[PDB]
Symmetry: D2
Subunit: 116 residues, 4 copies
Amino acid sequence: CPLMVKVLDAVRGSPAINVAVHVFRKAADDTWEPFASGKTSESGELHGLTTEEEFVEGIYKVEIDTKSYWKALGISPFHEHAEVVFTANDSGPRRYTIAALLSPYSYSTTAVVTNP
Amino acid sequence: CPLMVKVLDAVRGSPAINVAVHVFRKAADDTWEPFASGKTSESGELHGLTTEEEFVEGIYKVEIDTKSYWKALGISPFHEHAEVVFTANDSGPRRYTIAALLSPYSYSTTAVVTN
Amino acid sequence: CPLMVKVLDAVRGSPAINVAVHVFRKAADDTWEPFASGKTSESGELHGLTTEEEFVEGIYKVEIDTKSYWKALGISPFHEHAEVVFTANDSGPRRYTIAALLSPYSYSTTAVVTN
Amino acid sequence: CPLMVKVLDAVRGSPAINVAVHVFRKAADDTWEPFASGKTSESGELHGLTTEEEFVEGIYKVEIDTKSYWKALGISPFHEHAEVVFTANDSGPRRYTIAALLSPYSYSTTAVVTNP
Ligand SMILES: COc1cc(C(=O)c2ccc(C)cc2)cc([N+](=O)[O-])c1O
Ligand SMILES: COc1cc(C(=O)c2ccc(C)cc2)cc([N+](=O)[O-])c1O
């Protein structure tokens, strides 16, 4: 599993469950092509987005649907979504965890990149 | 000044100076229309982006060119840029500060919205 | 003003107003000696804590009374308080801003140190 | 394992390995009594600090030795250590993960609290 997304809720001190995530990859014509999508589990984690074969070098955008998350909980937040945009696999295959910590008016994101 | 952007460097403990910032407004066709731009000052702040007259309700994107900032310091960063996407609302308070705190493999953003 | 403390609320997107802040200096016997204190203003800022003459090199602790802040808002928080412990150094730049960004179960802190 | 500590490095995009952690508990006389200590593993995690029986209700301080971490890597950081101070188990036993994200002049900490 070369791309994993983990989301935490800083208000409740819990995993952020059922957060929708959409991943895009920049195509040859410079548009954002849909690449993979899913939702976080009870642990706040989203596994199984892609495969080693499919996750080639490119520029990827991970869009974490934070507004949809807060509004499903009945809260009006500030951001539409969090966007994490990065070049992947340009020195060979790596494993990427994109972690996000959410509050209604703030979020932080970090990447943990490992070499198998 | 209804919109201000402030950028900070978590590695050196300093304002992030001379960082390019581009603001876009979402158009009716869902594309991003250039709206305003500038570079952060010696304080890490970018003032004067827009006016109350121009800054109507809608969805805006603030793009912060973090990659060039880190590379000009000789540091290899993870992200292409940082993006902050939000709705401007007239029911809320009138002044928006979008603050960003930068590290090579991480960034955070908060909104401080006041009258 | 060699030391300023700024506190922000990540839940409401606002300055954190009327937050108690206590600063201590580490004494020769390793205890914490009261040094300065105050409450954040309407801007979330606390100015005037000390002077260049009083703020000598050494280890300081800034304690931010986050628990009372959240409870006054009717919110149950995780931490007793936030603590920031650091060394003041004359080799560095002269002005220290300790900024804190608060959520009920999380907080972050950065130092912005400038001339 | 009712108390776990996880530390990440925001400069390198990696777990923060070999970070020393000291846990204290406020005693009846209001002093900080040493409670447990350890160091983060190759995954950035520290398991095995305490037991369900030993981890009674109280006020705990988790001291993450961030300066020692950065100085062992040859970097001069701003903070002496990160301190996370919280009441535990006052509504019955819970499981606590204290997560920290480190940069030389900044850190963030979050708690993930679950009910077995
Ligand atoms: C990256 O892995 C994790 C991160 C965190 C964080 O709290 C967090 C902090 C800052 C950011 C930006 C993101 C995550 C907590 C858990 N955990 O409870 O297992 C993790 O596994
Ligand atoms: C030095 O002056 C400021 C510092 C910062 C921060 O350090 C901050 C932390 C987390 C984040 C995400 C952003 C910035 C914030 C504001 N501000 O918001 O007004 C300041 O005016």
